[PDB]
């Protein structure tokens, strides 16, 4: 099918006989010359020490949220560690984690009971998902957990969770208020009693508990992926840039095939990618040195194969549509 | 005043559906002759035009 303009038709017609006429094959397309990978340059490693090795994870009811920025994803370094009992990525397929730089990255770290790591995922409900921590339905990120039972256990009563709350949380909402919970009609007046419960009940953890009660350390990342100015990048080197030639580009994880050209388009400081009527990305801003590149796809213009019947003669004459005769 | 011919159009269905992308273009082959029976319809127009 790729041999030459004639045989491009026979595959279309699904026939080895091509009758006398004119046939328009697919628009002639230029294969991408070489690959381009352009990421912002920073040498830093994300605090995988201060997130995953942190000495004290906060309780689930008040969970810490640590913005990660201006670092390269060290993801290969986690491999010597307690590893992970569950690693579940909702937005991204975990293979692409290296190829793809991130934007707003917040590690949300807390310690929950063994049975309840299930409950952290969009759509789940239960004591964790309803009351003391909640994930959006559109959530994009990963959920990482590994047992701390060799550390967090002694009985360790410090880790603590909110058992009673009037209603369910909104996504990523934190309520640390300790005000007493009123089961019946009578006001509690700030003291425990009949139909009055102190809402925060502490986990017990012994070192000997079953896998249900062994504390897991959950760390829930979040990110927007595309559409936003990149900060946290992947462990992938950046290459040289090529202008005005058909290339295979990777800009801040956005990939495709285009002809990178200069442009006068002016992005406001917070804008990164431009988009078209067809929403295919028209213009990007070179991350290393900030300037606006127009992405024009390769493969413009139609082809038409003029042929007498292959039964008669095997010669063809190709018609390229609206090109003065130079390029091809 | 009467119309006579209408603008002759032709669509490239491989290119419109999966733009210049290999991983996608392979998938469009499973759907098969959809692509190839459009251009048989838009040609029958452009011939009688």
């Amino acid at each position: 099918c790729a041999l030459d303009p004639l045989s491009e038709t026979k595959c279309t017609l699904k026939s080895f006989t091509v009758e006398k006429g004119i046939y328009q094959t697919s628009n002639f397309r230029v294969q991408p010359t070489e690959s381009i990978v352009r990421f912002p340059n920073i040498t830093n490693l994300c605090p995988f020490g201060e997130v995953f090795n942190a000495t004290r994870f906060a309780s689930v009811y008040a969970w810490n949220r640590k913005r990660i920025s201006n670092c390269v994803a060290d993801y290969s370094v986690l491999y010597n560690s307690a590893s992970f009992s569950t690693f579940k990525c909702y937005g991204v397929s975990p293979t692409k984690l290296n190829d793809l730089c991130f934007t707003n990255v917040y590690a949300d770290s807390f310690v929950i009971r063994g049975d309840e790591v299930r409950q952290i995922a969009p759509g789940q409900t239960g004591k964790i998902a309803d009351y003391n921590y909640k994930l959006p339905d559109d959530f994009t990120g990963c959920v990482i957990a590994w047992n701390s039972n060799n550390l967090d256990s002694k009985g360790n009563y410090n880790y603590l969770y909110r058992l009673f709350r009037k209603s369910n949380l909104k996504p990523f909402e934190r309520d640390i208020s300790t005000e007493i919970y009123q089961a019946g009609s009578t006001p509690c007046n700030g003291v425990e009693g009949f139909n009055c419960y102190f809402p925060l009940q502490s986990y017990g953890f012994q070192p000997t508990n079953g896998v249900g009660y062994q504390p897991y350390r959950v760390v829930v990342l979040s990110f927007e992926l595309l559409h936003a100015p990149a900060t946290v990048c992947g462990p992938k080197k950046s290459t040289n840039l090529v202008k005005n030639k058909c290339v295979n580009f990777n800009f801040n994880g956005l990939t495709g095939t285009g002809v990178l050209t200069e442009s006068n388009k002016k992005f406001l400081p917070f804008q990164q990618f431009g988009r078209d009527i067809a929403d295919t990305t028209d213009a990007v801003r070179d991350p290393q040195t900030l300037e606006i590149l127009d992405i024009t796809p390769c493969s413009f213009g139609g082809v038409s194969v003029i042929t007498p019947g292959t039964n008669t003669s095997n010669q063809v004459a190709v018609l390229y549509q609206d090109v003065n005769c130079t390029e091809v | 005043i009467l119309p006579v011919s209408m603008t002759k159009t032709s669509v490239d269905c491989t290119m419109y559906i999966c733009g210049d992308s290999t991983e996608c273009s392979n998938l469009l082959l499973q759907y098969g002759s959809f692509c190839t029976q459009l251009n048989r319809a838009l040609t029958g127009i452009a011939v009688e035009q």
């Binding site: 413009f300 | 002759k8 159009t9 032709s10 669509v11 269905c13 491989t14 290119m15 419109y16």
Partner: peptide, 28 residues
């Protein structure tokens, strides 16, 4: 011809092309 009358640059990039009519506006 004065009464009857980018846009086509974003049509050929996707595939929606316009073939020329066989008979020119001159031959007609």
């Amino acid at each position: 011809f004065n009464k009857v009358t980018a846009m086509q640059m974003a049509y050929r990039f996707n595939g929606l092309t316009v073939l020329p009519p066989l008979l020119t506006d001159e031959m007609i």
